[PDB]
Design an enzyme around this catalytic site. Structure first.
Site, short mmCIF file in Angstrom:
data_model
loop_
_atom_site.label_atom_id
_atom_site.label_comp_id
_atom_site.label_asym_id
_atom_site.label_seq_id
_atom_site.Cartn_x
_atom_site.Cartn_y
_atom_site.Cartn_z
N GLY A 127 -1.93 -8.77 10.79
CA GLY A 127 -3.32 -8.95 10.38
C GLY A 127 -3.52 -10.20 9.55
N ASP B 57 -1.84 0.59 0.69
CA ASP B 57 -2.93 -0.33 1.07
C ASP B 57 -4.06 -0.28 0.07
OD1 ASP B 57 -1.36 -1.21 3.22
OD2 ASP B 57 -2.60 -0.30 4.76
C1 LIG Z 1 -1.77 -3.84 -2.19
C2 LIG Z 1 -0.86 -3.12 -1.25
N1 LIG Z 1 -0.90 -1.80 -1.05
N2 LIG Z 1 0.05 -1.61 -0.16
C3 LIG Z 1 0.57 -2.83 0.06
C4 LIG Z 1 1.71 -2.94 1.01
C5 LIG Z 1 2.63 -3.95 0.70
C6 LIG Z 1 3.77 -4.12 1.45
C7 LIG Z 1 3.98 -3.27 2.53
C8 LIG Z 1 5.26 -3.52 3.30
C9 LIG Z 1 3.06 -2.23 2.84
C10 LIG Z 1 3.37 -1.44 3.95
C11 LIG Z 1 4.27 -0.36 3.87
C12 LIG Z 1 4.59 0.35 5.03
C13 LIG Z 1 4.03 0.00 6.26
C14 LIG Z 1 4.40 0.75 7.53
O1 LIG Z 1 5.44 1.58 7.46
N3 LIG Z 1 3.72 0.49 8.67
C15 LIG Z 1 3.93 1.02 9.92
C16 LIG Z 1 2.82 1.25 10.76
C17 LIG Z 1 2.97 1.79 12.05
C18 LIG Z 1 4.24 2.10 12.52
C19 LIG Z 1 5.36 1.88 11.70
C20 LIG Z 1 6.73 2.20 12.18
N4 LIG Z 1 7.96 2.48 12.60
C21 LIG Z 1 5.21 1.34 10.41
C22 LIG Z 1 3.16 -1.08 6.35
C23 LIG Z 1 2.83 -1.80 5.20
C24 LIG Z 1 1.90 -2.07 2.08
O2 LIG Z 1 0.01 -3.74 -0.60
#
Ligand SMILES: Cc1nnc(-c2ccc(C)c(-c3ccc(C(=O)Nc4cccc(C#N)c4)cc3)c2)o1
Length: 349
Positions: free
Chosen positions: A30, A165
């Site tokens: 994104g 998020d």
């Molecule tokens: C502000 C703020 N709030 N959250 C964040 C943030 C920051 C870093 C990460 C990696 C993430 C984050 C953590 C986990 C995931 C995640 O596991 N995504 C995902 C989605 C769909 C499928 C899979 C798989 N296998 C994994 C994505 C993103 C969120 O920043």
């Protein structure tokens, strides 16, 4: 001690990460950044790795990068996303241009759960308990999530939940337009910019989420901001004079006063068959006047959670200094602040 980094192209984006992270696989993309799932050979954890997109492109982007990194470094709670690692392949501030954030890999969100499973009252108790447990923590640091919805709540196979998020930037107007989940969980004061909003905006979203867990259906699926407001007022009643006075937006105030007055509905007749204690809690969360909504700490003590409530295991957060929110700095100053935070990072146990 600098780890060795290796390079790879994943979907025409170059990933340069420490050796410990293996089996990188694109999982999302994104304007926020690209995301990969990986295996952290050092901890044995499945991780999500986020590469920030052009983090220092403008003042606004640089400040946002600093904000996100500050926030993630602070959050240390079972029911809140935390940071496992942050790195950059840069060897100096001078070459610093990429930030990678590492967290637990989430897999499933509450959106997946509500669609594909029967949730008993016991599941709703457990899931809402954890959200409120995490929000007590977040709110104790004067952090507002602002964007709580089922897709931002990860749930593992044991129904264990983390909030992720955090709202870090205004969604575009387009993103909030029409028949969209991006708006269905928002407090009306924030949806319509009634006033300086506070942390109970998050309690409103919890009410919408809880309702959806109970019925399997979106509580306020408006086709636009006004349709949604009408859905809301129909349930909770039109505002009284006391709330009207607190709407500082003269324009909004004048519009709401144009509506035919409507009483608050009987929630036992909306949530048919639901636990009476769940209904009582919904009534305390879904209050139009944000001053009068139940807080997370108050809700944790509600009888609905008798089975899970433990006042010795509902921690608050360390003080969180967000005075940076008030500063106008140059890009290179935001970048240097971000660099400091990268190099001072200490992994959790
Ligand atoms: C502000 C703020 N709030 N959250 C964040 C943030 C920051 C870093 C990460 C990696 C993430 C984050 C953590 C986990 C995931 C995640 O596991 N995504 C995902 C989605 C769909 C499928 C899979 C798989 N296998 C994994 C994505 C993103 C969120 O920043």
């Amino acid at each position: 001690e600098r780890p060795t980094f290796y390079r790879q192209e994943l979907n025409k984006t170059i990933w340069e990460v420490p050796e410990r992270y293996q089996n990188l696989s694109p999982v999302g993309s994104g304007a926020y950044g690209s995301v990969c799932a990986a295996f952290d050979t050092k901890t044995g954890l499945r991780v999500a790795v986020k590469k920030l997109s052009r983090p220092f492109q403008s003042i606004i982007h640089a400040k946002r990068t600093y904000r996100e990194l500050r926030l993630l470094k602070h959050m240390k709670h079972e029911n809140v996303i935390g940071l496992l690692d942050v790195f950059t392949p840069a060897r100096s501030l001078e070459e610093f241009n990429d930030v990678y954030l590492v967290t637990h890999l989430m897999g499933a969100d509450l959106n997946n759960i509500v669609k594909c499973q029967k949730l008993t009252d016991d599941h709703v108790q457990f899931l809402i308990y954890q959200i409120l447990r995490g929000l007590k923590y977040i709110h104790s640091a004067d952090i507002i999530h602002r964007d709580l919805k089922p897709s931002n709540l990860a749930v593992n196979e044991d129904c264990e939940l983390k909030i992720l998020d955090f709202g870090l930037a205004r969604h575009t107007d387009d993103e909030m337009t029409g028949y969209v989940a991006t708006r269905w969980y928002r407090a009306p004061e924030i949806m319509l910019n009634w006033m300086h909003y506070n942390q109970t905006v998050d309690i409103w979203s919890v009410g919408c989420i809880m309702a959806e867990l109970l019925t399997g259906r979106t509580l306020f699926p408006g086709t636009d901001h006004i349709d949604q407001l009408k859905l809301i007022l129909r349930l909770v009643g039109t505002p009284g004079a006391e709330l009207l006075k607190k709407i500082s937006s003269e324009s909004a105030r004048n519009y709401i006063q144009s509506l035919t007055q409507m009483p608050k509905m009987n929630f036992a007749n909306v949530f048919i068959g639901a636990n009476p204690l769940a209904v009582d809690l919904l009534e305390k969360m879904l209050v139009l006047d944000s001053d009068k909504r139940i807080t997370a700490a108050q809700a944790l003590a509600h009888a609905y959670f008798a089975q899970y409530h433990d006042p010795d295991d509902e921690p608050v957060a360390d003080p969180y200094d967000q005075s940076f929110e008030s500063r106008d700095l140059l890009i290179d100053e935001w970048k240097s602040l971000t660099y400091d935070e990268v190099i001072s990072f200490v992994p959790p146990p």
